[PDB]
Write a protein that binds this DNA or RNA. Structure first.
Lengths: 262, 143, 206, 64, 50
RNA sequence: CGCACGCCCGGCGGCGACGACCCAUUCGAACGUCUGCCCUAUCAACUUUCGAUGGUAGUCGCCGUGCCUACCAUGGUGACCACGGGUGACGGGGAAUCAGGGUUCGAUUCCGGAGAGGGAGCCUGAGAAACGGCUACCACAUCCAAGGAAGGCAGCAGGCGC
RNA sequence: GAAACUGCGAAUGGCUCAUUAAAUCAGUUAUGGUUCCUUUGGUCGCUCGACUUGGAUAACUGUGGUAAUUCUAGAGCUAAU
């Protein structure tokens, strides 16, 4: 090409959108924004496919152009706006609040929260930076700058921000025995307690994490997001609490529930 | 002894004409647990591309070869030997890839057959992308 | 136009490359400024990303720094003496980064004199009739003289700088690319550099 | 760049030897016995059980 | 060779055709934007400069 | 620039659109690192003062570099197949065939590259050496009141030719 | 609300496979060696020295040239992010 691309073919689209093959040729190329294009979920896909309020692109346009949807306490009338990990989608008229967090599998969960919980979010810090006159800056995972942070917060800590003011309330420090969700790799959406961090000068540091049932799994430090102190989640977790039971167990649970149901 | 070329050879970091009433040396540790050698700290050469005492930063790959030729100046040819696995015949074939590599005047007495560790840095020349970090002398060479 | 790329020339071995694509824009090349000594002339160039790049075509003043005692003053360039790269760039007296130029000694002399309470340049016997320099070298109050006498303790300049001041042209090296930024910022040569360059120009003299 | 399948698959394999008296005389008994209309009706089901037997074998070799 | 003459003061304009050599002969080999005396073109335009 | 319209002796504030140097973020692009390709010896030597491999100083560039100048040094590649040649060769994910190995195919809807009749040069812009943009030169070619003028289907249809 | 000035887009998409044999390309990494419209979040009395200024142009009125085209010269008036 001779410039930035604008189309996204339906086959080349990120898989965890769970797009069918025979509907169309193109997929909603997510508008540039806070989250990455492969790690986002466009407002059109979340609104029409998961909740199934809208039936088509026109209905998604009509639902959002009435200023109804509000991503992180700020109104967004953009259908391809990238709503990503740790966001508070607040549909006001139905009186529902959704938080985008990874299901036990590699996909986003339709996870409803309470309006008291829908007033903060849990941001990971990406870089700490000294300003133009010794004014320290944070830069979080969702491309959000906060200046004059806590002098203690460092480059892999999690912060809790208020959603209107956009300022730090608390922070969870990156160390052993802290709840972490995995936000990349094959272990995408596993909730576990940090066991060991292994430094690799030049390469990517690999972090060993232990699940709630003594299941142990590693992932490179880029794909970790601490969401709790000790074993205490600071937000509500989805049904399953990021365990990933085996296909043998998932088969047993499915058919056993079916037998008892009838 | 130094300053053979037209322009004045000096380390651009330090100032050498402070009004007063030996020259200090610019050098740095290069990380990855490599020892900043003694000819770098003490010596009196000027080298832009010396990874210890000059403007170049080691990042990416760290490889090792065996010294083949040392004929062009402040540069050596090392020879990296490996085995490539053909799958039809469940056998290997002996291959080699000799690459151009910057040798600092720090590493004073290096002979051919020495096991030279190199680190990747910014393109230094047309064919040169690596820089010698340490030298291991060939088995023996005591006498 | 002028292509600035690797694929037009031979490999590490000496084989010929076949060009798999025609000339691209980002592989650009513009003509050399070859900045001369005259009255100020700068042309602007729109470069990649829509930024600006100033071609100094003629330039006679520059911000030079005699950084022994930290005194920098905007100064008038007169001519070029020596150039390490090429010798014809001195004949066709072009400024390039790391040239050797003569600069007006008067702002540095003025500062040195007004600071240290001693004369500089000013050959022996020459009468100082204007006598505003008299007021700059004489008439101090009480404790200011305690300040200027503990100052002039370390007022001693080196011989090779004194020689140049007495003539009225200092040797300086251009530390800013005049073709790129549209400037001629530099530093005055001192000690080891100055000895090296005075020798190189005398070998050029013959 | 059309939005389509192109995903098709054959459901029968024709036998290598076209004129084995043993095989012709076998398959015609199954056609007449179960009221199939052509040899492909038999070849289709020979192919379905051939797949099942193949996948059974591949698992039956696996480290217990 | 027609003359599309205009008058800014009023702001009107008229196309007056000429079919003579010696009337137009004064205009010839004079550059554009040269204020010329338009007396020779007719007895009507006595002491006009265009 | 637009809806709101206010708050006390002529005074007297929210909510938006648009714009703007710099910083981060996103979408990227660009240039490098390591390893990997079909047939050929009726291709055994190749590269280099008009850059071939290095050194110093600059020039140019969005930056790193022989990218390009000046002055030095004589290097760099090869039987582990370089250099040259052929390809009915765009590369890969893949496709047909298959006991196990394997052989042949991959112009073809997804990713990457290249090109808009053949080569070269440039304008504007964050982004192009852009052709459903411009400027010539070769090839072809349309309309001419004979002065001039307008071209580019390897886009969708469709027509000749093959 | 036609037109027209202004801003933006036209560099994506679509088509073909002629070039091209360490080239393209694939897996792996680097920019501590760079540029970035837009999106998003910061900055936007940090500088010690006017209750709104300036003069053109288009559309429009009017007069034309050419066998000719999304060609256009001349005149009079009037806007701005």
């Amino acid at each position: 090409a001779r410039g930035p691309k604008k189309h996204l073919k339906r086959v080349a689209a990120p898989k965890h959108w769970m797009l069918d093959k025979l509907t169309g040729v193109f997929a909603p190329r997510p508008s540039t924004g806070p989250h990455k294009l492969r790690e986002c979920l466009p407002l059109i896909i979340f609104l029409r496919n998961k909740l199934k309020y809208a039936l088509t692109g026109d209905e998604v346009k009509k639902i959002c152009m009435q200023r109804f949807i509000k991503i992180d306490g700020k109104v967004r009338a953009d259908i391809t706006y990238p709503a990503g990990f740790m966001d508070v989608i607040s549909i006001d008229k139905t009186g529902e609040n959704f938080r985008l967090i990874y299901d036990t599998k590699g996909r986003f969960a339709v996870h409803r929260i309470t309006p008291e919980e829908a007033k903060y979010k849990l941001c990971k810090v990406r870089k700490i930076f000294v300003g133009t006159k010794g004014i320290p800056h944070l830069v979080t995972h969702d491309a959000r700058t906060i200046r004059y942070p806590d002098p203690l917060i460092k480059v892999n800590d999690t912060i809790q921000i208020d959603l209107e003011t956009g300022k730090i309330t608390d922070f969870i420090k990156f160390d052993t025995g802290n709840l972490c969700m995995v936000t990349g790799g094959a272990n995408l959406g596993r909730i576990g307690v940090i066991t060991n961090r292994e430094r690799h000068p030049g390469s990517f540091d690999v972090v060993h994490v232990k699940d709630a049932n003594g299941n142990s799994f590693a992932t490179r430090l880029s794909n970790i997001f601490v969401i709790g102190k000790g074993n205490k989640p600071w937000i509500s977790l989805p049904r399953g609490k990021g365990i990933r039971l085996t296909i043998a167990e998932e088969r047993d649970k499915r058919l056993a529930a079916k037998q008892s149901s009838g | 002894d130094i300053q053979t070329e037209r322009a004045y050879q000096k380390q651009p970091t330090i100032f050498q004409n402070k009004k007063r009433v030996k020259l200090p040396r610019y050098y740095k540790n290069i990380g990855l647990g490599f020892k900043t050698p003694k000819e770098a700290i003490e010596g009196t050469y000027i080298d832009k591309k010396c990874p210890f005492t000059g403007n170049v930063s080691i990042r990416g790959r760290i490889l090792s070869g065996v010294v083949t030729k040392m004929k062009m100046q402040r540069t050596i040819v090392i020879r990296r030997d490996y085995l490539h696995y053909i799958r039809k015949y469940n056998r290997f074939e002996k291959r080699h890839k000799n690459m151009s590599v910057h040798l600092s005047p720090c590493f004073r007495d290096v002979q051919i057959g020495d096991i030279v560790t190199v680190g990747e840095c910014r393109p230094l020349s047309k064919t040169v992308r690596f820089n010698v970090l340490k030298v291991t002398k060939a088995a023996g060479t005591k006498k | 136009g002028i292509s600035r790329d690797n694929w037009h020339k031979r490999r590490k071995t000496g084989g010929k490359r076949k060009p798999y694509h025609k000339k691209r824009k980002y592989e650009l090349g513009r003509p050399a400024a070859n900045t001369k000594i005259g009255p100020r002339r700068i042309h602007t160039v729109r470069v990649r990303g829509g930024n600006k790049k100033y071609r100094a075509l003629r330039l006679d003043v520059g911000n030079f720094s005699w950084g022994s005692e930290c005194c920098t003053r905007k100064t008038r360039i007169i001519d070029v003496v020596y150039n390490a790269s090429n010798n014809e760039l001195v004949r066709t007296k072009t400024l390039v980064k790391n040239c050797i130029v003569l600069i007006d000694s008067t702002p540095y002399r003025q500062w040195y004199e007004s600071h240290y309470a001693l004369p500089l340049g000013r050959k022996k016997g020459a009468k100082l009739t204007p006598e505003e320099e008299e007021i700059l070298n004489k008439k101090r109050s009480k404790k200011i003289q305690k300040k200027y006498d503990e100052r002039k303790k370390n007022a001693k300049i080196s011989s090779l700088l004194e020689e140049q001041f007495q003539q009225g042209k200092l040797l300086a090296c251009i530390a800013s690319r005049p073709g790129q930024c549209g400037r001629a910022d530099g530093y005055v040569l001192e000690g080891k550099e100055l000895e090296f360059y005075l020798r190189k120009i005398k070998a050029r003299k013959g | 760049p059309v939005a389509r399948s192109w995903v098709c698959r054959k459901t029968y394999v024709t036998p290598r030897r076209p004129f084995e008296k043993s095989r012709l005389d076998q398959e015609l008994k199954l056609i007449g016995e179960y009221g199939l209309r052509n040899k492909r009706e038999v070849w289709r089901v020979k192919f379905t059980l051939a797949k099942i037997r193949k996948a059974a074998r591949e698992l039956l070799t696996l480290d217990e | 060779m027609k003359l599309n003459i205009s008058f800014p003061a009023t702001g009107c304009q008229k196309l007056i055709e000429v079919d003579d050599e010696r009337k137009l002969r004064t205009f010839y080999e004079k550059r554009m934007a040269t204020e010329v005396a338009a007396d020779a073109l007719g007895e009507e335009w006595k002491g006009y400069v265009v």
